[PDB]
C-alpha cells in the first residue's frame, strides 16, 4: 500500500507503461532487423544492437527522425509504420502530463528559521502585490524608528510575478510561505507562538464584506485556538461583525488585541469633518508614513500641503528636563525649542490625556505624543537637557543624551 | 593526459566542504555578529545597499564576459585537453581574474545563505565548483582543459534576478518575457557545451577512441534542429554518451521549445496596434467619436456624416474606443484613410483625451448601443 496519493499513482503508471512499451518495442525491432525478412530467405538483414534500436525508436517517437539509423527489412519498415501511428500519440501525451505532474509541487514550502534576537510578525488574509506593497512601504518606511522586525507572509496562493519580485527586493527581512492560518501545522511552520503579533488584512473591494469579515473572524479564531496570547490585529469591513470577535473567550484588548474596523473609522473621520471642515484630511495624513519631496512644477499651495503630509504622529519618552513642568510649559518648550508639536501624554494603571490643562504635571518617564516629520525628530525630546542643550540655536545640534 | 586532475579539484572542493558541514551538523547536534554579517551579506547580494547595486551590476557584466571568454576558448581549440603555458594564454589570464571575482561572490553568497548544507547543493554552487578550482589547476600545470566550464552558460539564469534587484522589470509580462528568453537561451547554450564535450572527448569505455570533432557551433545548431524536431541528420551524435545525452535532451527540450515558442508569440502579439496620437493639421476641423464603436455603428455613421449630398467640408473623424477594430471595421477605416482615424483608448482617461487633442476638436459625439441588455446601464 505504498502509492497513497492519486497524482503519485498516475506518475508511476505513466512512467512504467511508457518505459516498458519503449523497451519492448526496441526488442521487437532488434529481432526483426537482425533476423531479416523470412520471404527473402533471411538474406535482407541489418545488424543493429539493441541500444541502436532503443535510440532509433526514441528518435522516431519524438518525430525528430535523424535517419543516421533506419529500418531496412520489410518487417522492420512495416513495424516502424505501425509504431509511428501508435507511439507519436503516446510520446506527445506523456511528455505534457509528466511536465504537469512535476510542475505541481509547491515552491514556497518549508518553515521560518527563527533567529537568536529578531522579533517577527506574521501577516495573512488578503495577500496580493497591491496589499503587500502598500503594507511594506509603510511598515518598513525610512521615517520609522530603526527596528529589525521580520515580516512573515502566510497565504494559500502562489505569489504572482510582481509579488515574487517584491519579495526578492526585501529578501533580508520579508519571508513568504504557502499555507493557511486555518491549519495548526502552518501556524507552527511560521512559529506563531514566538511572533510579536499576527496581522490579518482584508479585501476592501470584495463582492460581500459580511462574507469577507466572516472569513477573517475564522482566522482570528484559528490563531487564538492555536495559542491564546498572540497579539492579533484584524482589519474588519463591517461594524456589526466586531461584536462576534469581542465575544471570543481569549480576545483581550488590554493584552493589545485590536480590530481596525474600516467602516467605523471611515465614518468617524468624515463625521469629524462636519465639526471641522477639512479635518478628515488633516488627520488621515498623520497615519501614513511619508517624507516630503519637492518637485519644481508644484504651486505654492501644493508645496505647503505636501510639507504638511510629511508629518506623522509618534510616541516618545520626555527627558527628565520636562519633569514637574505643566503640560502647557512642556508643549511651549517642545514647539519653541525642539520644533516638535507635543499634543498628548500617557498619565501613569495609566491613561492617555490629550491637551491636558495646567493642573497636569509631567511625571518622570512620561510618554508623550508628537506630530513631527520623522522618528529622528522626536528623539530630541528624549535627549533634551536644561543645562547642556538649552542655549542651542539650531535643532540639529540637540543630540547624544547631553551627558 | 591530465584532465582527471582538473575534475578531481572540483570534486575534492565540493566533498571537503560537504564533509566539514556534515561533521559540524553532528557536533552541534550532540552538544550577534554572525546574524549581523548574514543580514549584511543578504542585503548586499539583494542590491539593497549602493555597494550591493555595484556588486549586482558586476555579476551581470562579468557573467556575460566569462561566457564570451568560453565561446572564444571553445571556438579556437581542437583537443579538449590542450598544452599551453599560462604566461602565454591571455584568455586564461582574464578567465582567472573573473574566477577570482566569482570566488569572492561565492563566499558572499555563502555568508548570506540561511542553511549552509542546502547552499552547498544549489545549482550555482556546482557551477562554481566545476569552474573555479579547475581554473587554478590551469595555473599549476602548463595546460588547460575545456572541461565542465561550459556550465558558465547557466550564470545567465541570474540575469532576471539582477533585473529584479535593480528594480527595472516593472511589469509582469516583461518579467515573464525575460525569464523565458534567458532560461531558454542559457539551457540551449549549456546543452550545446555538454554535447561538445561528449562528442569531442569520445566514449571513456572505448578508451576515448570513438570520438567526433564537432565545433561548439555545430553542436549549438544540431541541438536547435533536434529541439524543433526537424532532425536533418546532416550532423548527428555518434558517441554512446552523445547518443544517450541526445535521448535525454529530446525528452526534456521538445517540451521546452514547444511551450516557449507559443508563449513568446503571445507576449510579442500583446502590444497595442492603434496606439499613438492625432497629428492636428494646420486648418482642418476634427470631431472625436466614442461610446458604441462597431462595424455597424461606424458604417451607418460615416455613410451619413460623409454623404455626397452634404456641403463640402473637410472635417476629420477621430474614433476613440477600447477595442481592437474587427477585420470588417479595419477595412472600413482603410477605405476612409484620408479623413477617418482610429485610436485605442477611452474618454474616461485624460491621457487618451489628450492624445486625440479633444480641446481642439469641434465636438465630441457619444454613440449608444440601442440593443443592449439594460438601457439604464448603457445611459
Ligand atoms: Ca514623515
Ligand atoms: Mg530572517
Ligand atoms: Mg488628417
Numbering used by the authors:
A (entry chain B): 214 to 561, 567 to 621
B (entry chain A): 14 to 44, 79 to 426
Copy the relevant paper text:
A voltage sensing domain (VSD, segments S0–S4) and a pore-gate domain (segments S5–S6) reside in the membrane. Additionally, two homologous regulators of the conductance of K+ domains (RCK) in each subunit (RCK1 and RCK2) assemble as a tetrameric gating ring (4× CTD) and serve as the cytoplasmic Ca2+ sensor.
Mutant R2Q also led to active-like VSD structures, regardless of Ca2+ binding. This result suggests that the interaction between S2 and S4 plays a pivotal role in voltage sensitivity and the VSD-pore coupling. In the R1Q (apo and Ca2+-bound), R2Q (apo and Ca2+-bound), and R3Q Ca2+-bound structures the S6 gate adopts an open conformation. The resolutions attained for each mutant were as follows: for R1Q, 2.7 Å in apo and 2.9 Å in Ca2+-bound conditions; for R2Q, 3.4 Å in apo and 2.9 Å in Ca2+-bound conditions; and for R3Q, 3.6 Å in apo and 2.6 Å in Ca2+-bound conditions.
